[PDB]
C-alpha cells in the first residue's frame, strides 16, 4: 500500500517466530534489529550513524515477513533503540518513494 | 517521480543560494544539514540515532527546494556526515512510501 509520512512509517514484521514492529527506513543501507535470539553463525560488524558507531552481529539468509511480504536477507542485530528495515530488504518487497 | 531504492535516494536541494545533495530519509523525524551558513536566530537542540546524540542548531522557516518542489520548514544544522531530508519536509512535498 501507500504510506504517507505524517507518522513514523512503522509496520509489523515477523522474524524467527516473533512479532515485532519495525520502521521502514530509506536512509538505512542495512536492516538492524534490537537484540533478539537468532540461530546460525554470525560475523562481527560495525555500523555508523549520527552520534557514532555500534557493534552489531550479522546474520545471512534470515527469513522475514514485512507486512505480508516474505523476503530473505542479511539482518543485523544490535543496540538500536528501534527496529529498522533498510534498503537491502525494502528493494525485495519492491518498496519505492513517490512524490 | 518514482524512486526505487537500489541506490541511496539522493536528490538535489537548494538552500540559501547553495546547491547540495541530500538523502530522502523516511527514518528521520527532522531535517538535518551539514554545517553551513544560515541567517536568523537559532535554538540549541539535541538529536539522537544509532551510536549516540549530537548538538544541532535549529532554524525555523527556512525556504528549501527539494528537487523542484519548494517547502518551508524547520531545518537543523550539525555534525552529520550526510545531508538528510526528514519527514517534517517530506510531507510538504507529498512524499509517500509505496509497495
Ligand atoms: C540505521 C543505520 C544502519 C544508518 N546508517 C547507515 O546506513 C550508514 C550509511 N552506515 C553504514 O552503511 O554502515 C556501513 C559502513 C560501515 C563502515 C564504513 C562505511 C559504511 C543510519 O543511521 N541512518 C540514518 C541517516 C544517517 C546516515 C549516515 C550517517 C548518519 C545518519 C537515518 O536514515
Ligand atoms: C537522522 C536523525 C534525525 C534520526 N534520528 C531521529 O529521527 C530520532 C527519532 N531522534 C529524534 O527524533 O530526535 C528528537 C528527540 C530528541 C530528544 C529525545 C527524543 C527525541 C536517525 O538517526 N534516524 C535513523 C534511524 C534511527 C532512529 C532512532 C534511533 C536510531 C536510528 C535512520 O533513519
DSSP secondary structure letters along A18-79: EEEEEEE-TT-SS-EE-S----S--EEEEEEETTEEEEEEEEEEEEEEETTEEEEEEEEESS
Counting ligand 1 atoms within 8 A of each CB, the residue from B83, B84, B85, B87 with the most, and so the one to mutate, is: B84
Q: Would you call B78 exposed, middle or buried from its count of C-beta atoms within 10 A (0-12, 13-18, 19+)?
A: middle
CA distances from A12 to A15, A19, A32, A72, B1 (A): 10, 7, 15, 16, 27
Residues A28 and B99: their CA atoms lie apart, in Å, by 17
| Other Cβ atoms closer than 10 A to B54 | 18
Residues B94 and B89: their CA atoms lie apart, in Å, by 9
Kindly report the three-state secondary structure assignment for every residue of B47-70. Answer: EEECCEEEEEEEEEEEEEEECCEE
Atom of ligand 1 nearest to the CA of A76: 3
Question: Looking at the annotation, which residues of B are catalytic?
Answer: 25
Residue A90 φ then ψ, to 5°: -60, -30
Residue B39 φ then ψ, to 5°: -70, 165
Residues A10 and A26: their CA atoms lie apart, in Å, by 13
Counting ligand 2 atoms within 8 A of each CB, the residue from B5, B28, B56, B83 with the most, and so the one to mutate, is: B28
Tell me if B49 and A48 make a contact (CB, 8 A cut-off): no
Fold of the B1-99 domain: Cathepsin D, subunit A; domain 1 (2.40.70)
Any idea where the domains of chain B sit in the sequence? 1-99
Which residues from A are below 8 Å from B when comparing CB atoms?
Answer: 1-6, 8-9, 23-29, 32, 47-54, 69, 78-81, 84, 87, 90-91, 93-99
Method in brief: X-ray
Residues A86 and B75: their CA atoms lie apart, in Å, by 24
> Which DSSP helix (H) or strand (E) runs through B85?
strand B84-85
- CA dihedral (B73, B77, B83, B88) in degrees, to 10, reads -30
| Resolution (Å units) | 2.0
Quick one: cell of A37?
535470539
Count residue pairs from A and B with Cβ separation < 8 A.
135
Quick one: cell of A35?
537484540
Amino acid at each position: 500500500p501507500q504510506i504517507t509520512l505524517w507518522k513514523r512509517p512503522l509496520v509489523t514484521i515477523k522474524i524467527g517466530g516473533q512479532l515485532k514492529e519495525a520502521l521502514l527506513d530509506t536512509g538505512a543501507d542495512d536492516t538492524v534489529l534490537e537484540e533478539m535470539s537468532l540461530p546460525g553463525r554470525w560475523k562481527p560488524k560495525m555500523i555508523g550513524g549520527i552520534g557514532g558507531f555500534i557493534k552489531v552481529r550479522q546474520y545471512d539468509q534470515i527469513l522475514i515477513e514485512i507486512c505480508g511480504h516474505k523476503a530473505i536477507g542479511t539482518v543485523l542485530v544490535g543496540p538500536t533503540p528501534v527496529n529498522i528495515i533498510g534498503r537491502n530488504l525494502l528493494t525485495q518487497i519492491g518498496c519505492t518513494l513517490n512524490f
